[PDB]
Amino acid sequence: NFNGLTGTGVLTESNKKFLPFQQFGRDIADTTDAVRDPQTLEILDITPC
Amino acid sequence: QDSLSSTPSALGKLQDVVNQNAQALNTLVKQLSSNFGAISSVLNDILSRLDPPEAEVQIDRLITGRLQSLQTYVTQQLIRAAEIRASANLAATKMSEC
Amino acid sequence: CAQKFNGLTVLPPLLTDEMIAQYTSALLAGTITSG
Amino acid sequence: TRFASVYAWNRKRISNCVADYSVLYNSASFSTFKCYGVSPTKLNDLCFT
Ligand SMILES: *[C@@H]1O[C@H](CO)[C@@H](O)[C@H](O)[C@H]1NC(C)=O
Numbered sequence: 001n002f003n004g005l006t007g008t009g010v011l012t013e014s015n016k017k018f019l020p021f022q023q024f025g026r027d028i029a030d031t032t033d034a035v036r037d038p039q040t041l042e043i044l045d046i047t048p049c
Numbered sequence: 050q051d052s053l054s055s056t057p058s059a060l061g062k063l064q065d066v067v068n069q070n071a072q073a074l075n076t077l078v079k080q081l082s083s084n085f086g087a088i089s090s091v092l093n094d095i096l097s098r099l100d101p102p103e104a105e106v107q108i109d110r111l112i113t114g115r116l117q118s119l120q121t122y123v124t125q126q127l128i129r130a131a132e133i134r135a136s137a138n139l140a141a142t143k144m145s146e147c
Numbered sequence: 148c149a150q151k152f153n154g155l156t157v158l159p160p161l162l163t164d165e166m167i168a169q170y171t172s173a174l175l176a177g178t179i180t181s182g
Numbered sequence: 183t184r185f186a187s188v189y190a191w192n193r194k195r196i197s198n199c200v201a202d203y204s205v206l207y208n209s210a211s212f213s214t215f216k217c218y219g220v221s222p223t224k225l226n227d228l229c230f231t
Contacts, residue, residue: 029149100223
């Protein structure tokens with residue numbers, strides 16, 4: 001549950017170069033596939049189990 | 050040897066099959082972004098916001114739309130599959146006779 | 148990749164491309180040597 | 183102390199804070215408490231802009 005965004009999956013460190021304003025990424029199915037952690041500001045990838 | 054090496058459109062018949070199938074799948078996935086009249090296209094948003102009675106209404110809307118999308122996909126694949134089978138039957142005949 | 152993530156998968160062909168090439172070369176060898 | 187007339191209703195914007203909605207919902211003091219688009223028991227799990 002990331003700042004209200006809920007789901008299930010495996011979290012890993014991401015190589016995605018988010019700009020400071022960007023909080024999350026999305027795929028073509030309108031599913032979040034990456035988030036910024038609200039406390040550490042680290043970018044995480046989200047993949048299904 | 051030389052013609053195939055200098056003609057970008059030479060294998061259009063095979064590329065068209067690849068393109069048609071890719072397009073159908075991309076369309077199917079993109080339909081998951083549709084609301085179909087629901088408050089959200091995201092099932093997790095609905096479940097995190099509403100209790101089961103109100104949630105069942107919103108979910109039913111997504112089920113209806115998503116089932117229709119999948120049925121459309123499958124029907125198109127069956128029709129396309131028949132066309133490919135006819136082509137394969139012709140190819141098999143040419144293998145035998147040519 | 149993201150298709151898999153939504154329940155969409157691709158099943159591999161029973162015959163690999165190597166195997167199809169083997170069939171093709173057998174047909175060519177047959178034709179060339181025995182008409 | 184003073185409430186507005188309905189034709190000239192007041193509006194306050196709330197942001198950048200922690201919202202505990204259970205203290206209101208579990209109160210004995212309100213004759214009406216009706217939620218739309220959201221269930222009151224889930225409000226404490228949610229984030230809003
Ligand atoms: C609180 O969050 C901020 C980022 O918004 C971070 O820089 C800070 O270190 C966090 N504080 C603690 C104690 O983790």
